[PDB]
Amino acid sequence: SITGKGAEKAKEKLAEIIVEAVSAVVDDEGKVDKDLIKIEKKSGASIDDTELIKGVLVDKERVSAQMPKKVTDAKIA
Amino acid sequence: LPENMKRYMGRDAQRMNILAGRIIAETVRSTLGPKGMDKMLVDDLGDVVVTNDGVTILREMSVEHPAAKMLIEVAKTQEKEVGDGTTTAVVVAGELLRKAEELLDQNVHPTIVVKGYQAAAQKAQELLKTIAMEVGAQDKEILTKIAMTSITGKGAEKAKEKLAEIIVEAVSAVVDDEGKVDKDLIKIEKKSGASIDDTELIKGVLVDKERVSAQMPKKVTDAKIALLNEAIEIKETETDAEIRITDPAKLMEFIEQEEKMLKDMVAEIKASGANVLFVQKGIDDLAQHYLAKEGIMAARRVKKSDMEKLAKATGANVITNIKDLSAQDLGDAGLVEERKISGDSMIFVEEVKHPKAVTMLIRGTTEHVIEEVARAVDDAVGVVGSTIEDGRIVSGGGSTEVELSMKLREYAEGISGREQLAVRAFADALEVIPRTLAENAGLDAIEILVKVRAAHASNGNKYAGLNVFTGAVEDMTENGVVEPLRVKTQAIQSAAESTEMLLRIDDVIAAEKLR
Amino acid sequence: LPENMKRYMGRDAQRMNILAGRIIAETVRSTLGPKGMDKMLVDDLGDVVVTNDGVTILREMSVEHPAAKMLIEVAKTQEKEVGDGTTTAVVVAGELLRKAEELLDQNVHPTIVVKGYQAAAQKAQELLKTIAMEVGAQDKEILTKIAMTSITGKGAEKAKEKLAEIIVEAVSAVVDDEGKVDKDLIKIEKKSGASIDDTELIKGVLVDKERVSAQMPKKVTDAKIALLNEAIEIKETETDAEIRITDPAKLMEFIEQEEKMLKDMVAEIKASGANVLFVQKGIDDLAQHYLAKEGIMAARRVKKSDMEKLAKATGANVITNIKDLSAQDLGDAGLVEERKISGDSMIFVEEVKHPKAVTMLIRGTTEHVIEEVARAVDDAVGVVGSTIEDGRIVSGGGSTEVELSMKLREYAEGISGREQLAVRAFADALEVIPRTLAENAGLDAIEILVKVRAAHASNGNKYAGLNVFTGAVEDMTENGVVEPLRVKTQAIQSAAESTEMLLRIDDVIAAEKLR
Structure with missing residues (x-):
């Protein structure tokens, strides 16, 4: 194919x-x-x-650079 | 008949694609090389730009034809955006398109033309690997000749x-x-x-701005820099409020209260310990006073491109809200100074935290050559970077294209199959480069081609090319005319892919809102 | 064929570019020299300007052709800015463009034409150095002869x-x-x-305004000057407030409150100790009263250029906010007086702090010679200044171009190569200057050219030129007709570069949103 x-x-x-x-x-x-x-x-x-x-991929940036770049054991909302 | 009718519109449509592609190639063709001619770009507004940089032309042109848009895109895009041979690729593509027309008229099917061009393009890649010369990334003399050549x-x-x-x-x-x-x-x-x-x-990094208030210090040492992406102004309530004054004494109290707000904003900034401040938006005139009175060097309405390079250089974080500002978010610079140059003045950020920041300041008498030298240095940065990473170079001045052309006609004799016709075409096409180079020098392009061929014949000199200054065929390596291997490889690949695309498109169809 | 089609469109384009430049050259050509003809400029509004200053024409023209715009830019911009040689550059350029057409028709490639023009221009640079005469930068009589000539x-x-x-x-x-x-x-x-x-x-510096209120003093001695870049008005709340009056007693009470605000603003101004005040914006009518009652001479709505020249002259600082205004910020001038000139009136600032600041007040009966003398004086300041810096002058009146032209024909015989044809042309091109000068005087331009050539024959007289007043060929140095070396070199340089631009442009291409 x-x-x-x-x-x-x-x-x-x-x-x-x-x-x-x-x-x-x-x-x-x-x-x-x-x-x-x-x-x-x-x-x-x-x-x-x-x-x-x-996992799933999103094309976005964290809205504020002050937010953590990396998050472990994430609870997503 | 209906479906045989589409085939007549299509085969014309494909030929119209090639036609547009050939026209794009010819528009930039004369700009190649040391003697390359320059073109005059004019817009609806009437203001003009004159440049010999082919990529700038292709980027700034008025091109309306979809095949032309596509050929430019495929050839322009490259695996390593560092270094520009793209214009050379477009020229070869346009020549490859010329040859393909003849093969199509002779009833060579497009895929067979592609098969030959792909075969010829790969063989060119390998030959380039074998002819190339290796240089040390720490060798300064070779890198200098790379630059001078570009x-x-x-x-x-x-x-x-x-x-x-x-x-x-x-x-x-x-x-x-x-x-x-x-x-x-x-x-x-x-x-x-x-x-x-x-x-x-x-x-360090350079910004073109003036200190927003002359009362502010021109120079600050041991600078803690704050980058603010929010305007400094009186803050409105998003909730749509108006204000009523019953007492004449309160008429001043509101003015004074909003003045207090501006003091409070400046104090919060000074509370982080920032000496120097850059803001992408504007600063209220009165807040400008309190920043100056607080001893902070500030600039308003700074371009976003400066904002990001300041952030990456000094280690500061770009901040959307004054509340986000913290001592950790500040950038570090040894000295931040507004300096006066011949024409105007600008803010220098030097002794930066991260040594990676560097700035090339190009001066000159006339602006239309300023842009030109500026555009040239970007390419010169490109070719040198590729040389440091790859560590391989080839002789310039069209010498490489002549060698490949002869070796490909040799390779074409080995092909047993119908695509032989296309391989010689690809081989013949590469000769447009030295021929163009020769004619831009005011010489007879055909004799130069023959003279250069003769130098590459028998065993021959693989570096031999035309020296435009002496007018004689000479060894390009001995003359220090050299260019990165990656430049030649990316040029052949882009030339072949871009031509393969137009060649592979049979029909053009009207569409409804693509993107 | 597609690509052979572009080559015909480009050749048309270059011939049209050369054509466009030649028209610009001829439009200004007759304005050269003491007898130079003047042109009448008219616009859409119907009002006109009649001037002999070629740079003013080139600047104020209605030029529609992109190639003309470029030739103007390259020739107009020049290092060190002498100011009277720009038109000579354009005229010589147009003559080089004429010559280039014939050379191109003879199948001389553009780069070879450029090669000849570049060679000939440098040889002209060198000859000017040797022909030039050195003068003391402190020699006032020659500086006057520089002035009178210009x-x-x-x-x-x-x-x-x-x-x-x-x-x-x-x-x-x-x-x-x-x-x-x-x-x-x-x-x-x-x-x-x-x-x-x-x-x-x-x-001192001169400002064209009247005191904003006739009640203010016409004359002020030992003036402390305040420069305010902010309007004097009632300050609105940035939060957009409205006011309600429930009590008829309060209706006056608010008005009286605003009156208090204006007094306090004026009071802050007088608190700085200012005798005189200039404001780039406007002054509320009531504030004008309070300024007059305090004995302050003030002018509103002052041009920013005036604000800037006042600040450097008196030492005052331009101040954006009343809070920033301080006694340290004031400028010092011995006398500030509003005086009436024939016709209207103006504010003279004299005995200023900065001794270098100086102003030339040009008087006269008719305005079109007033503008013309002003334009004349601006060039003379440039022309005289260059002599002080460079300390070298040459004989004027076309003598230099005739010497250069003949020596270049001598030099051209020595060139072995194809650019010799372009060198001879470049030499012949310089003869347009004396020939133009001769015809503006009502004489036979060709016989004058021959007579001057004859005067330069043998070892001859390098200074021999036409005296338009006597109508005979005479020594320009003994007649005191002289001009700076820098002007002649910059004119030669501008003429060569501008033609080199058009010659290097083969095609003109449509673009979208260039700047």
Whole structure:
């Protein structure tokens, strides 16, 4: 499915990542829930640096720099 | 018939794309090299800018054609934004588009043209790796020749070697422990008057502003700097209030009460222990008094670009609310001084906490060359940074393009398959560069091409090119004309990708609100 | 073909650029020299300006063509600012552009034409150094001859020598210990009535205003001057308040309260000890009374340029807020008096603190010669000052250009290369100056050119030129017709650079929101 769409350098790498993400979201019924997999895109580096993240990604900055850059054991509102 | 009708509109549409792409290439083509011609940009308002910097033209042009917009974008964007060969790429792309028209008329399918160009482009990459010369990132002489090569023809001839040394000195400072060069850490500032000989390097960040009140100190040492992104004014209630005065004695009391507020704001700032203050917005005239009376050097309505570089340099945090201001949020600078220069005055921030901040102050007599030298230094910073990171260079002056061209025609003889036609085209196309370089020097571009080819023949000199000053074919390495490897590689890749895009687009379709 | 199409559009564009520059040159060409013709400028509103000052035309023209705007900018801006050589640069430039057309038609590439012009311009620079004559910066008689030469033909003919001495004395006063001349300290003022014989030199700064209230004193001695950049009015609450009056007794009570406020503001002003007050903004009518009752001479709505020249002259500080005004901030002047000139009236500030500050008050019957003499005097201040700094002069009246042209034709025979053709052209181009000078005098421009060439023949006379008054070729030094070296070099430099710009621009491209 990916062939010819512009990856063409590491196809299989990107494919292995897809397979892993899809294999994880199979529920007890055996059906696949697509909504849990989000696809994000950002410039720089190269497709070889494409990575799979075990959480959700937001493109935003903390509204005030005075807020902590890093938070552990986060309770999110 | 309906669907055979689209095929006629499409194949014309693709040819119209190439046509637009070729026109974009030709508009900038004459600007390449030491002798490169400059173009005059004019807008609706009537004011004009004259520059030979091709990227500035492509960026500032009036381009209306979607294929032209796309070709510019693909070629302009690069993996390493540090260094500019982009104009050279656009020119090669436009030549590659010319050749592709002929292959298409001969019934070579577009994918086969792409297959040849991709094959030829990769082979060019490898050849560049083998021809390149390695240099030490700590070698100052080579970095200087890199700069002089990029600066040649940009209008500072007597200041060329001096200005190059300053650039190398400036770039060498920003090399981190990683060995990588951060281009944002080098700041280029420009103001007219005096002469280009007076161009100087400042060890801190420079802001062009005047102290908001002359009553404030011009100079502050051991500065604790506060960066405020909020205007200093009388604070309105967001809740939409009005005020009624029943007593004439109270008419002054309100004025005096709001005056007290301004005192209270200034006191809170002084309470953090800040000597110097920069604000992106405005300062009430009366609050300006109390800041001066409190001995604080302040400036109002500062540009946001200055605000961020001050924050990164001094370690201060940009602050949205006066309540956020704390001693920890302050930046540190050894000296903050408003200094008078030939033309005007400006605020220097020097002896900064983080040594990474550095500023290139470019002087000169006429502003239209000031912008030009400014634009040239940005590229010169680019090529030098790439040289420090990669540590590989190639001979300039079109010598590299001629070598690649011959080696690719050689490689094309090896191809067994239908894409052979495209590889020679890619090979032939690269020769536009030296040919352009030769004609901008007032010479016969064809004889120079043949003379340079002859130097690269047999075994030959891979560095041989035309010396525009002596008019003879010479070894470009011995003449010190050199440019980063990354420049040539990024140029071929961008040239090939941008041309591959237009070549891969068959139809153009009207759309509804894309972005 | 697409890319061969652009090359024809660009060539049209360059020919149109050269065409556009030549028109600008011819529009101002006849204004050169003592007999220079003057042009009548008219605008949309219908009012007109008739002037012989070419720089004024180039500045006030309605120029629509981008190439003309650029040629004006490059030629107009010059280092050290002499001021009378700009038009000569433009005229020579237009002649170089004419020559360039023929050279381009002959298939001389632009860079080779530039190569020739650059070579010839430098050789001209060197020749000027050797032809120049050194004079003492303290020599007043030659400085007067500099002045008379520059003012000649501007309509001051009767009073030329007197007015020249006034210029020399005015410039001689502002020379600092460094030896440099500060132009900003000399102010040029103009008012109608009387005659140019009544032009006088004032030892202080002059302001054109009347005292805001006739009740104020016309004359003040030992004045303590206050410069206020803030309006004197009732201060509104920044919070936007309204007022309600329930009691008829209070309706006066509020009015009386505002009266108290204005008294207190005036009281604070007198508390600083100011005799005289200048305000860049306006003064409330009632405050005018309270200022008069306190014996303070005040003027409202003063131009900021006046505020700035007053501050440096008297030593006062411009003050934005009444709270900042203090006795230390006041300026000192021996006499401040409002006097009536023929016609209206003005405030003279004399016996000022700063001895360098000086003002030239130019009188005369007709305003269009008044403006013209003013414009003339401004150039003479520049022209005389340059001689004091440089200490070198050359013979005027076209002698220099004829010497340079012939020596350059001599130099051109020595050049072996393609730019020789451009060198000979550059030499021929300089002949436009004496030829123009001769025709403005009502003579045969060609025979005068030949006679002057003949005078420069053999070892001849390097100073020989046309005396427009006697109509014969004479020694310009013995006739006292001389002008600074710096003007001639800057004119040669400006003429060469401006043409070099147009020659390097091959295409003109449409842009969007350039600045």
